[PDB]
Amino acid sequence: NATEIRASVGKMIDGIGRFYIQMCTELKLSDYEGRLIQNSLTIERMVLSAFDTGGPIYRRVDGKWRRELILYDKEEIRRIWRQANNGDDATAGLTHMMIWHSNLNDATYQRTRALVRTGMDPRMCSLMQGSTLPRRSGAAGAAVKGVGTMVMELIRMIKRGIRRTRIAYERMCNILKGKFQTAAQRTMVDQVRESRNPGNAEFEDLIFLARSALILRGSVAHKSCLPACVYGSAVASGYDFEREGYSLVGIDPFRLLQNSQVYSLIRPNENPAHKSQLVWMACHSAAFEDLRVSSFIRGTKVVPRGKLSTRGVQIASNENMETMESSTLELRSRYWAIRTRSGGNTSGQISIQPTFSVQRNLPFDRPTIMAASDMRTEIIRLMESARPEDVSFQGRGVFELSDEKATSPIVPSFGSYFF
Amino acid sequence: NATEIRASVGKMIDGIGRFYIQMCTELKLSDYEGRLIQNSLTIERMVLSAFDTGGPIYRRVDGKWRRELILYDKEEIRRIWRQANNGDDATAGLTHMMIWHSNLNDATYQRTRALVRTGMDPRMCSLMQGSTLPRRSGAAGAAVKGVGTMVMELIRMIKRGIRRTRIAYERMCNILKGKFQTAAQRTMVDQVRESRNPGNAEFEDLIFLARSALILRGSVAHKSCLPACVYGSAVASGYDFEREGYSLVGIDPFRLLQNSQVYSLIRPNENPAHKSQLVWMACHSAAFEDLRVSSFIRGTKVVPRGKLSTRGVQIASNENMETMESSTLELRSRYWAIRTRSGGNTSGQISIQPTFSVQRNLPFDRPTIMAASDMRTEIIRLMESARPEDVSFQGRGVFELSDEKATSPIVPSFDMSNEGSYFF
Amino acid sequence: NATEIRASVGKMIDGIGRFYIQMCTELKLSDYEGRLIQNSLTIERMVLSAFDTGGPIYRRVDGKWRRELILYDKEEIRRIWRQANNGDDATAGLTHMMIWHSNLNDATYQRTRALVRTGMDPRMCSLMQGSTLPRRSGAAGAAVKGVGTMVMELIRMIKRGIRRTRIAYERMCNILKGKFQTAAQRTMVDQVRESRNPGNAEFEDLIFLARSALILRGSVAHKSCLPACVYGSAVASGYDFEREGYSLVGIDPFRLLQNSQVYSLIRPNENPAHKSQLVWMACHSAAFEDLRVSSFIRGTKVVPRGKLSTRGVQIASNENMETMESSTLELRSRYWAIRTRSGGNTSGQISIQPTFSVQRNLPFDRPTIMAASDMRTEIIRLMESARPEDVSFQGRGVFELSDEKATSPIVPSFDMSNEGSYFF
Amino acid sequence: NATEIRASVGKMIDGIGRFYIQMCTELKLSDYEGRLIQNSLTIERMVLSAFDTGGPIYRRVDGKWRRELILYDKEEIRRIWRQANNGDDATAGLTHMMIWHSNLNDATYQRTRALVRTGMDPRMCSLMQGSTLPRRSGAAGAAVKGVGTMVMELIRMIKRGINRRTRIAYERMCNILKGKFQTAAQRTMVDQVRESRNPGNAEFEDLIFLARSALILRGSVAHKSCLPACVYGSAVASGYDFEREGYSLVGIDPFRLLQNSQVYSLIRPNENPAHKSQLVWMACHSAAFEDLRVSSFIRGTKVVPRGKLSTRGVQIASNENMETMESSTLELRSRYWAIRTRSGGNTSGQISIQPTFSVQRNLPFDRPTIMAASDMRTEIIRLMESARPEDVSFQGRGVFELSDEKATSPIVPSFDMGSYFF
Ligand SMILES: Cc1onc(-c2ccccc2)c1C(=O)N1CCN(c2ccc([N+](=O)[O-])cc2Cl)CC1
C-alpha cells in the first residue's frame, strides 16, 4: 500500500511531466528555454486557467531575452492535459501545481495588509501557509492550509454574517479542529462550530485560537512541489515515475533537485544566490520554517526576507526586457530531511549526568519533567507551560543524499524568522 | 536521408532486441538472468560464432550462482537470427554486436604484446581502436578501426613479404589514407600503396605515420553500441525502434542506458563501481578518451585502468562459482555528448584590444595566430607546431538527457579534480 | 600641471560646443533637430572639409523626416569656427572630431578588403584602430592609431616603391616603435627603420610584427570622443567646461552621457537598441574591446557585429525618408571605467623545484631563461609564453557613476561560458 | 630494512621530543607556552648552539605576553640532550632541527642580495633551498641543498682562489653537485669543473651556466618534512611510541602528526594570522620553491606569493614591542597529503588521447616522448629548447586522503583553483 501510493503519486508526476514536454513541442522552446522557471510558470498558469488563455513566454534570441505574449484556446490545452494524463482529467496533477504556486506565494509575499483587513494580528504570518490557495482545492489543498488561513476564511464568513453555506462553515470548522493537537483547542473549535448565530464572540475565539497556534502549533501538511519544468525534464530523460514510484515528503524531490537544472530571469540590481534561495524555499515549502534549520539542510545560509536582493520570480508586463539577464537557480542542498504534518507537541532519558568537568549547559527535557473551569484558561495554562527552548522531534535528523533509506540521522547544534 | 537512416538503424537494433528476447525464451531465463551482462555476452558470442557452438550461461539457484555450458547447432541459432529479423540476413546487426565486443576489448586489455610483435611502439595504444575486430566487419567496421589498427594490418601483410590480395592491400591503404586530415599525411600513404613489392621501406613509412597519428590525429568513428540484453529489454517494454528511429551517435544510446537495468557477476575482491566504469566506457567507445571529459559527462569520477579492481567482465572456465556475487551496474551519466568521427585537427577578429583599465584576461585565438620538399619533414614541421594546450571542438558542448534535438550546448570546464587523463 | 591639462581640454570642448550651438542657430534647427546625431555628423563633417562644402541636413516637417542637401561656403564656416574658439585655429578641436568619426568607423566597418589588398591577414581587424584616420591628424591622431594601422601605412609605402619621403617612412617606423611594449619588438622595428632598400624582407618583418601585436599587444590610446551635439547641449545648458575641467579618459564623458539626450534616425528594419550599442561603443573607443567587459560596463549586453541590426548612423542618399522614424539612443551605462593607453603585458623566482610527487607540469619562465641571437626567435618565444588566460590590469576595476574620484573599484568575476568576446 | 629505517628515524624523533619535554620542565612552561613556536625556536637554537647560551622565552602572564631572556651553560644543555637521546650524542637529531630551520629560512627570506654578491642571477632563488644551512651538516644536509646552493659554495671557493685539504673540499662538493644532476651532459660538465687544477674564471662561467640549466633541466634535491621540536615533544608527552610505531620524513607520518598537533605563534598587530600559518606550513613540508597551485591543492586553501603575505616572519626581534603582541593558533592541517620526492622529474602506456566526444577541450599528448622524432654547452642547450613549461612530470602520481594510510588511491589536480612564491 505504501508501494501503491508511490505508484499513483508517480503517475501524477509522469502526467505533469508529459504535459510539459508537449507544451515545449508546441511552443518550440529549446531545452534551455523549457528550463526557464518563468516559462514554466506561464505554462502552469495556462493549464490551471484552462480548467477554471495565455501569458508571457521568454525566448533567447541573439543573446538577449525576448518576451512575447502567447494566446491559446482553453479547449486545446484541456485536451493536451487529458492526452498527457492518458485520457483522464487527473485533478491531482492540477492541485499539485496549485500547491507549488501557493508555496511560491508564501515565500514571496508578506500577507500583512490582508491580515489587518480581516482584523487579525499582522504578526501571525507563520500560520498563513496556503492563504493564496483557492477554497476550490482538494483534500490535498486543505492539508496544506495553515491554522491562520483556516481562521481567516471562517472570519471572512462571520464578518459577512453581519442554507448550503452552513455546511461550508461547519466543514471548514472541522478541518481547523483537525489541525489542532491539544484536547482543549479541539473542544474550542466545537463551540465555534455549534454556534447557530456566529457573532462577535465567535470571532474573538477564532482570533484567540489563531494566537494559541503560535505556541500550541497546528498539524499542517508540507509537500515538496516543484515547477513543472523539473518534472518535464525528468520525463524527457526517459525517467519512469510510475514504475519507480515517487513521494512528496521523502527523498524523491531532493534527489530530483540534485540533478535537475532550472534557470531564472534575473533583474540587473538582483543577487542570483538570493533568487535561488527564494525558489528553493518554495520547492520544499519552507517559508515559515526555522531559518537555522533551512540553512543547515541547504548547506549555505538562508537569510531573512528583508535581506534578500530579490524582487520576486514572475516578471511584470511593464518591466524592461533589455536589462534582463538570467542565471542558474542553484537548487541543490547538503542534506535532505523528511517533511512532517506535525507542529510537534510536548521511556528514554530525560536528562544528562555530567561525566567531565567542562564548560557547557546541562540538558534536561523541561516539559516532561515539569508535569510535577474555562477552555480559554486551560489553553492559557499550557502556553505558559511552554518555553521557546523545548525540543520537538526528539531523535530526528537530516540525511546524507547517499542515504536512500533514511538510516543514519544528523541532529544540528544551532533571529530565525523569514518575515 | 537523415530521417530514414534512423528508421534503418531502428530496424537493426530491433532485430537484436527481438533475437535476444527469443534466446531468453529458448533458455528459460529469469527476468534477472536475461539482464545479466555475462549471459548477454554468451548469447551475442553464439550468433557471431554461428555466422562465421555454445558457451556459459549463469543461473541463480538457492541464492547462489550456477554456471553451465550449453551447446546449440550453429544452424539452429542462425535460424533464430533470421526469424527475429523478418527474414533478411541482418549483417549490420551482427556487426553492431562485433563492434560492442571490440569496444569492450579496447577498454579491458592493453594491446601491448601484439604491438612489439609487429614492430610498433607499445605507447601507440591510443590508436588501436578496433584492433580485436576482424576484416569480416564491413564499411561500419572500417570506420570504427583506428589509425594504428590499420597500420598494424598493413605491417602484417608487408612482413608476409618473406595478385587478388594486392588489391586488398590497396583498399586498406585507401581506408588508412581516408582517416588522415592533413594532405601531407595522405600523400605519404599515396607513397606506400603503389609500391608493388613493399618491404622495410614501406614499414618505415607506416611506423612514421602511426607515430604522427599521436599528434595529427586521424578521423575514427565512435559508435555507442550496447550489450544485446539492453536492446532486448527496450523491445520487451514496447519501444518500437524501427518506428521511433535510433542513432548510434546521438542521444538514443545515452537515454537507453539511463533507464535500463543490467546486472553483473562480481568476484570477491572486485569493486562494483569500478566494474561499472569498464562497461560504461565500453558502451560509449571511450577507452582512449580524455578521462577528464568522461568524468564530466558521467557525473562521477572515471579513473585509470591500473587503478581498477576488475579482472574483466568475462568469467574464465576455472573460476570459482561459490564465491561469486552479483550487482546492478551503474551505467547512467549526468550529461551526454555527440559521438564524433573527428580527430580534432586545426576572417574576423582573432584577438582583443583593451579599451578599459579593468582586471580581466585578454583573449586571443592562440592556435591560429601560431599557424605561421620532403613529405616526411613536412609532417614533422606541422608536428613541432602542435601544442597539447590548444583547444579543439570550439563551441561544441555536452547536453542534458532531455535535450533530444541537440539545442542547448553546455561547454564544460574540468576544474573538478580527477585521477589522470590517459586511461592507460 | 595636473588640473591645467583639464582646463585646456575643457577649452576645446567649450570650443566645439560653442561652434555647434552657433551653427544650429544659423541653420535654424529646432531643439529635437539639433540633438539628432545625423545633423551632428554633417555639421562635424563640414568643419573638417573646410579646414582641408555640404552634406545632408534633416528636418521634421509635416510629422515625418525630410533630407535636404544644403551647401555653405568653406570660407564662411572657417570663420564661424574661429570666433567660436575666440580667434584661434585651435586645431586640437578639429582633431577631436576626426577621432570621433574614426571610432564610429572602427565600430561600423570591417576592414577585410582593406587588409587583404595590402597582403595582411584579414583576421587582424583588432589591430586596426584609426585606419580611416588621415596622416594629417595630430600627434593626438597618431596615439589613437593601432599597431596594424601603422604597419599598413608602412606596407603601402614599401609597395608604392615597386627623399623627404624617406624621413616620412622613418617617422612612421618610430611612431610604431613607441607603441611596442617589449624590447624585442622594438629592436625589430628599428631594423625596418634602418633598411637601406625597403623591399620584401621589410614587408615580411612588418607582417610578423603585426602578427606579434595580436598576443604581445601594442600600446594604443583610447580617448572617449562624443558627437558635437552632446557638447553643444551641455554648453546650451550653461555648463562651463573651461571652469570645471574635462578628461577624455576620466569620468567626465560617462558623466556627460548619463545626463545627455541624443536622437537618431532609425530604418524600420533597424533595432533602436542595436543602433545605440554602436554609437555607445564609438563614444568610448570600444570597437575591439572584449564584449564581456563592454557588457559589464554598460549593464545591458553588447552583442557581436553579426548579431546587430544596423547599417550605420549615416543615411545613404537613395534611402526613402517616408518610412523613416526616429528615437532616443541609449547612451547610458551601469558603471564607468578608466581608459588605458596600455595593452596589458603579463626579478624574483623564474622556476619551480618540485617538493611533492604529484602529476603536473613544472613551470619555468622559458623566455627569460633561454634569453642567454636572432630577433624573430626571441619574439616567437615570448608569444608562446603567453596564454589567453593570463590576467592583465590586476587590482584595477570599474566604478559606480556617483564615485567621482577612483576610490572604490569593482573587480568583475567573468563567466564560465566565456567564448564569443570578439565583435568581428 | 624499510622497517629498520622507520625504527631509527623514529628513535631520532623520540629523542628530540624527549629533550623538548625536559626543556619545558626546567623552564616550567605551561602546555600552552611549550606549544609556542617562538619558544620552540629558542629551545632548538639553544641546543644547536650548545654543540657548536640562551635567548628569548615567552610566558603568558596576566593575559599578556612577556618576553624574558634566559641563559644556560652549554654543558648542562649538552648533558640534557644526551640524557634525552639515551646516552648518545645522536647527531641525526641535531641535523633534523637544522633542516627545519633552513626550511623555515628558505620560506622566510629572499636570498637576492647574497646572490648578486656571488655574481649569480638574482632570479635563481628556486635553486637555493638549503643555502642558510652550514657546510658542517651531515649526509642529510647535502641531500637537502639545492643545485644553486652547491654552485654558490663552489663559486665562493673559486672567487677566494684569486682572492691541500681544501682540494678535497672542492672536489667533494663538485661530486655532490654532479650527484644532483639527472642528464648525462650536465654530469659530464661537472667533471670538467672538478678536474680543473687551477679553477679560473672559465670554471666560474660553467657553474653559472649549470646553475641556469638547472632551472629547466632540474636537479635531484631531497625534500624532508621537519617540524618544530615542540610538535614532537607534544607527541612524546602524549605517550606516543616513535620507536615502536616507526616514522618517515617523506611519507604520511608528518602530515598525520600535524593533523592532531597544536602550535601557536606570537603575531604582530598589523599581521594576518592565516598568513603566518601559511609561512610555517610551507616550512614544515619544505615547500618554499614548490608550485603554489600544488601547495594550495594539498592544503585545501589558497597559498599566496611572498609579496601578498601580511607576515613579517616567525622569530621576534629584541627591540620589538611586547605590549602589542597578541598570539594565535597556527592552522597547520591540510586537505590532502603527498609523498615528497628527491627528483626534479626528467622528460609502455599511452602518450596521447583520441577524442570520443564532440566537446570543447584541449587534446592531450606527451610532447617530449613523441618529439624524439660536439660541445657540452650546446648539448645542454639542445635539451632546454626541447623542453616546454607544459611538459608533465610525475605521470600517474597524486595526493591522498588522510584516511588513506597506505597510499592506494591517487588524486591528480587540474589547475584552476603565477605559481612562484618569490
Ligand atoms: C537528467 C536526469 O533526470 N532525472 C534524473 C534523475 C531522476 C530521479 C532520480 C535520479 C536521477 C537525472 C540524472 O541526471 N541523473 C543524476 C546522475 N545520475 C546518478 C544518480 C544517482 C547516483 N548514485 O547516487 O549512485 C549516481 C548517478 Cl551517476 C544518473 C541520473
Author numbering:
A (entry chain D): 21 to 72, 92 to 201, 213 to 396, 403 to 428, 438 to 479, 485 to 489
B (entry chain C), C (entry chain F): 21 to 72, 92 to 201, 213 to 396, 403 to 428, 438 to 489
D (entry chain A): 21 to 72, 92 to 202, 213 to 396, 403 to 428, 438 to 481, 485 to 489
The article reads:
In total, the genome of influenza A virus encodes eleven proteins, i.e. haemagglutinin (HA), neuraminidase (NA), nucleoprotein (NP), matrix protein (M1 and M2), non-structure proteins (NS1 and NS2) and polymerase (PA, PB1, PB1- F2 and PB2). Among them, NP is regarded as an attractive target due to its highly conservative and multifunctional nature during virus life cycle. Interestingly, Kao et al. identified NP as an anti-influenza drug target using advanced chemical genetics approach, and reported that a novel small molecule named nucleozin could target this protein. NP forms large aggregates in the presence of nucleozin, and is restrained from nuclear accumulation, which in turn results in cessation of virus replication.
